[PDB]
Each structure stands twice: as C-alpha cells, then as structure tokens.
Symmetry: C3
Subunit: 145 residues, 3 copies
Amino acid sequence: GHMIHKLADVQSKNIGSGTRIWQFCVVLPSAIIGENCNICSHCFIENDVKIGNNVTIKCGVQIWDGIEIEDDVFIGPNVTFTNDKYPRSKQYPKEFSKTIIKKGASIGANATILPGITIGENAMIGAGAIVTKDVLPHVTYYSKI
Amino acid sequence: GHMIHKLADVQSKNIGSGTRIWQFCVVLPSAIIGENCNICSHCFIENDVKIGNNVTIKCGVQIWDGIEIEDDVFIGPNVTFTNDKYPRSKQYPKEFSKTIIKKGASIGANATILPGITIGENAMIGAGAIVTKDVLPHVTYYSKI
Amino acid sequence: GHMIHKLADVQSKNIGSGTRIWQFCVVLPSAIIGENCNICSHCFIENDVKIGNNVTIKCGVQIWDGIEIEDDVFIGPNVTFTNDKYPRSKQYPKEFSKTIIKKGASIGANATILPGITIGENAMIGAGAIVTKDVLPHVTYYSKI
Ligand SMILES: CC(C)(COP(=O)(O)OP(=O)(O)OC[C@H]1O[C@@H](n2cnc3c(N)ncnc32)[C@H](O)[C@@H]1OP(=O)(O)O)[C@@H](O)C(=O)NCCC(=O)NCCSO
Ligand SMILES: CC(C)(COP(=O)(O)OP(=O)(O)OC[C@H]1O[C@@H](n2cnc3c(N)ncnc32)[C@H](O)[C@@H]1OP(=O)(O)O)[C@@H](O)C(=O)NCCC(=O)NCCSO
Ligand SMILES: CC(C)(COP(=O)(O)OP(=O)(O)OC[C@H]1O[C@@H](n2cnc3c(N)ncnc32)[C@H](O)[C@@H]1OP(=O)(O)O)[C@@H](O)C(=O)NCCC(=O)NCCSO
Ligand SMILES: Cc1cn([C@H]2C[C@H](O)[C@@H](COP(=O)(O)OP(=O)(O)O[C@H]3O[C@H](C)[C@H](O)[C@H](N)[C@H]3O)O2)c(=O)[nH]c1=O
Ligand SMILES: Cc1cn([C@H]2C[C@H](O)[C@@H](COP(=O)(O)OP(=O)(O)O[C@H]3O[C@H](C)[C@H](O)[C@H](N)[C@H]3O)O2)c(=O)[nH]c1=O
Ligand SMILES: Cc1cn([C@H]2C[C@H](O)[C@@H](COP(=O)(O)OP(=O)(O)O[C@H]3O[C@H](C)[C@H](O)[C@H](N)[C@H]3O)O2)c(=O)[nH]c1=O
Ligand code: NA
C-alpha cells in the first residue's frame, strides 16, 4: 500500500507501494508515481507527469505537464520547473516543453530549471542555480556568485 | 460565477466572473480580483491588492499589501514579491512600498521582485531573475549567470 | 495563549504565548517556537528545530531539522534552508548540518541558505541571495547581478 495524507488532494490511482504523499499536496489524475517515493508537503503534480521509484520531492515543488523524473532522483525544496519558454497569460502552447531529470540526479534547493532541459544521470545541481542548458551526467553545476 | 476550491480560504467577495482559485490558497477580505483569472494552488493574496482580468498566477505566489497586477499578466510559479526594503521583525513600515506589474507583462518562475518596482507593459522577466530596478515596457530582462 | 489556524497541522505543544500559526502550516512534534512569533501560511517546521521570541516567518518557508532561529529574526517569504550538502535520495546523513540565524538578523525573500551556515546578529541578506558562506554580524550581503 501507499500513504496519502488526509490533508492532501490526490486524484491519481497510479501510485506505487511505499510512496508517501504529505499534507497540502495536489496530484492530478494522470500523474504516475513509482514505489517508495516521498512527496513532501505543499507540492503540486500535474497530469502529463511520470515519477520513477525511490524519488524524494522536498516541500514546495510543482511538477508540470511535460516533466519526467527518473528513479532515485532527489528534488530539493522549492525547486521550480517550467514548460513554457515565452509565457503569456491565456496563450496555451500547442505542446509543452519536456524536461527529464535522469536516474540518481539531485537538484539543490530553490534551483530554477528552464524548459526543455535534460539533467543527466547522477548530476548535482547547486542550491539556487538557474539551469538554462542541459547538464551532463555526473556533473556538478551551480550559478557562480 | 467564479470557482473557489473547497480547500481554499477565500475571504474576499471582490472576485470577477470566470476566475478560478485553487487548493490551499488564502485570499484576505479586501483583495480585488478581476474576471477569468487563474489563481493556482498554494497562493497567498493579502488585503491591499488589486489584480486585473485574465491574470494567471501559477502555484506558490504571495501577493502582498501594496502590489497591483494589471490585466493579462502572467506570474510564473514561486515568483516572490516584496514590500519592505529593510525588513526587521515587528518593525512595521508606516507605508508599504508599491509594486505594479503592468498589462500583459510576464514574470518567469522563481523570479524575485524587490520593493517599489514597476514592470512595464508586455515585459518578460527571465526565470530566477532578481529585479532590483524597474523594467521598461516590452523589455526582456534576466540575471545573467 | 497562542493561535493555531484550524487549517494548520500543528503537532508541537512547545509554542509560546502570542504566537500565530496560519493556514496550511505543518509543525512536527519536537519543534520549539517562542512567544509572539508569526508563522505565515504554507510553512513547514520539522522536529529538531528551535525558534526564539518575536520571530517573523513569512509564507512558504521550510525550517528543517538542524536549523535554529534566534530572537527577533525576520525570515522573508520563500526563503529556503538546507541541511545536506550532497543530497542523494534515500542516503540519510548520520548528522544533519546545523544552520543558526542569530538574534535580529533578517533574510530577504527567496534567499537560499546552504548547509552549516551562521548568519550573524542583525545581518541583512538581500532578496534572492545565495548564502554559501557565513555572514558576519550587522553585514548586508547580496548576490550581485
Ligand atoms: C554545489 C555543491 C554540491 C558544491 O559543494 P562543493 O563542490 O563542495 O563546492 P564547494 O567546494 O563547497 O564550493 C566551491 C565554490 O563554489 C561556491 N558554491 C558552492 N555551492 C554553490 C551554489 N549552490 N551556488 C553558488 N556557488 C556555490 C562556493 O562559494 C565556493 O566558492 P569559492 O571557491 O569562491 O570559495 C553545494 O554547495 C550545494 O549547493 N549543495 C546542495 C545543497 C542542497 O540544496 N541540499 C538539498 C536541500 S537539503 O537536503
Ligand atoms: C529569458 C527568456 C525569455 C529568454 O529566452 P531567449 O531570449 O530565447 O534567450 P535565449 O536566446 O534562450 O538565451 C540567451 C542567453 O541568455 C541566457 N538565459 C536565458 N534565460 C535566462 C535566465 N532566465 N536566466 C539567466 N540566463 C538566461 C541563456 O543561457 C543564453 O546564454 P548564452 O548566450 O551564454 O548561451 C527565457 O529563457 C526564460 O527565462 N523564460 C521564462 C520561462 C518561465 O519561467 N516560464 C514560466 C513558467 S512555465 O509557464
Ligand atoms: C540588499 C538590500 C537591503 C540593500 O538595499 P541598499 O543597501 O539600499 O542597496 P541599494 O543601494 O538599493 O543597491 C545597491 C546596489 O546593489 C544592488 N542590489 C540591491 N539589492 C540587491 C539584491 N537583493 N540582489 C542583488 N543586487 C542588489 C542594486 O541593484 C544596486 O546596484 P547598482 O549600485 O549597480 O545600482 C535590499 O535591496 C534588499 O534586498 N532588501 C530585502 C527586501 C526583502 O526581501 N524584504 C522582505 C520581504 S518584504 O517584507
Ligand atoms: C512527518 C511528515 C514528513 N513530511 C516530509 C518532510 C520531512 O522532511 C520528510 C521526512 O521524511 P524522510 O526522513 O524520508 O526525509 P526525506 O524527505 O527523504 O529527506 C531527508 O533526507 C534527504 C537525504 C536529505 O538529507 C533531506 N534534506 C532530508 O530532509 O517527510 C511531511 O511533509 N509532513 C509530515 O508530516
Ligand atoms: C485542476 C487544477 C488546476 N490547478 C491550476 C494549476 C494548473 O497548472 C492550472 C491549469 O489551468 P490552465 O490550463 O488554465 O493553465 P494556466 O495556469 O493558465 O498555465 C498554463 O498555461 C500557461 C500559458 C503556461 O504555459 C503555464 N506553464 C501553463 O501551466 O490550474 C490547480 O492548482 N489545481 C487543480 O486541481
Ligand atoms: C490574516 C492572515 C495573516 N497571515 C500572515 C501573512 C500576513 O502577511 C501576515 C500579517 O501579519 P503581520 O501584520 O504581523 O505581518 P508580518 O508577518 O509581521 O509582516 C509584515 O511586517 C514586516 C515588518 C514586513 O514589512 C512584511 N513584509 C510584512 O508583511 O500574517 C496569514 O498567513 N494568513 C492570514 O489569514
Ligand atoms: Na523560491
């Protein structure tokens, strides 16, 4: 079985064994979430979303349509994803940009990921980074101060 | 009519037709929100706040006292506004700084807007930018890495 | 007495007189919170956490295990703390890194604080800063654009 907090709104049935979804989360019906994930408080997870096994999503994260998270990924608190490069209110793209966070990668707290980004297997993104280009597998990337 | 989610705390009656306010939002009594807005999950909207028509506010945004959003604005997820330049706990300003986001402007995800800022009509703020100065109409501004 | 909003999940009994905890907050049982604090909507406060008196925590803040906030601190909205320098999903540190925010300090909106950080008494952190090193008492630090 899986644990959905009474104070979460989880509409998806596609949730693996051992997954925990905490207070004040929203998960829309088509989201797929694997086994032994931890979806911490105050997250939003849209429809066209795939999340693998053993994924940690810390508080305050939104996973939009077009985002895939592979197995063993860590997403730090308040990490921000995007799916529209030139957003204008009520101008809906024909297709959302796809982001994929590959197996074992980690995204530091409060990082911002631009649309269409690939972060490679076991990469490490520094806290507060802005990721405007793909990050190669096993690379440590941060936005220098 | 307008749609207020049962899991939102909306205290304002000043909400235009076609507006949607989603889960875990707080809207205080004096907030004014126009028609056909989308206030996504996990937002906070204070009292001395004016929001126009056709405004998109993505998840995780707080709109403080002193902030005005004009029509057709897009506010990306986790965009942060401010109204106190030198904040000290329990030292309440006599007047909050005013921010105005002008018609059709778009603010990228996880941008930070300092107090007293004007963002001009149809401007585009890059994801993760820090906006310390006014942005002219139709200008694309981002914080270079 | 103290004020816990009906839409908060506060599990701690260790809350001082005059403290307000607002909608959609989570506070875990061992958290200690002093007198006359304001914990604004959408915050998360873990177990191994000490918060002093007269502390303002604006919306969207998570205070992790290992974080201490002293008296009279201001924490701006969406300020992000961290306690694990090299996070990997399901790889739990033997010890979390400790952060201490010293008396009267202020952290600007949407700042990111790396693990193990001391911010000195009455320091001022700019909105959107990334704090990778200790900040001396009374110093104004921001990440230049
Ligand atoms: C990026 C990193 C992994 C790198 O650590 P590291 O490789 O040991 O780098 P380092 O040796 O500490 O620092 C090297 C330099 O980069 C800077 N730096 C490190 N992290 C940075 C960041 N996130 N942004 C900007 N600069 C950074 C340091 O200030 C240092 O600068 P100087 O050489 O000028 O002193 C780490 O700092 C980090 O950001 N970790 C993520 C923490 C996090 O978000 N955890 C998840 C939340 S808690 O579970
Ligand atoms: C700012 C921008 C509109 C600009 O796109 P653009 O004008 O096509 O710029 P670009 O040609 O992609 O990039 C030009 C340079 O600026 C950099 N850049 C682009 N966006 C940046 C940002 N947000 N912060 C820092 N640098 C940025 C690129 O890395 C590139 O650098 P090099 O020239 O060194 O390669 C876009 O990158 C962006 O930030 N969009 C907002 C996305 C968003 O937040 N959407 C809302 C959430 S989803 O609805
Ligand atoms: C850091 C500061 C306290 C400094 O204000 P200040 O010392 O008067 O600096 P300033 O004179 O305005 O600006 C000096 C320079 O630093 C830059 N700057 C100021 N704040 C900055 C920030 N947060 N990040 C990057 N640059 C910043 C300015 O752009 C200016 O650059 P130029 O000299 O190139 O013009 C203020 O800008 C700030 O960040 N305040 C926090 C606001 C906040 O988060 N409030 C809490 C939420 S509302 O309660
Ligand atoms: C009890 C409870 C937990 N949670 C979430 C947030 C807690 O931080 C988290 C605890 O679960 P866990 O021990 O499996 O922690 P993880 O979420 O796996 O994160 C910890 O371990 C990582 C390796 C990193 O070091 C990270 N910084 C840590 O927080 O679960 C809620 O959101 N609400 C709750 O009520
Ligand atoms: C069903 C539901 C929706 N919502 C919010 C968040 C969803 O992303 C949003 C969907 O409404 P919508 O289709 O009108 O989307 P918008 O909010 O208008 O944003 C989309 O379109 C923009 C032009 C940009 O491309 C943006 N990146 C997109 O997300 O509504 C909730 O918060 N909770 C919910 O339960
Ligand atoms: C009524 C209500 C208030 N609150 C929180 C958020 C409101 O901003 C806050 C109001 O309490 P307060 O007047 O004691 O304000 P503070 O939280 O102390 O912050 C204000 O004063 C500071 C010195 C800075 O200038 C800051 N920018 C201001 O917002 O309480 C909720 O989260 N939900 C609510 O329903
Ligand atoms: Na943020």
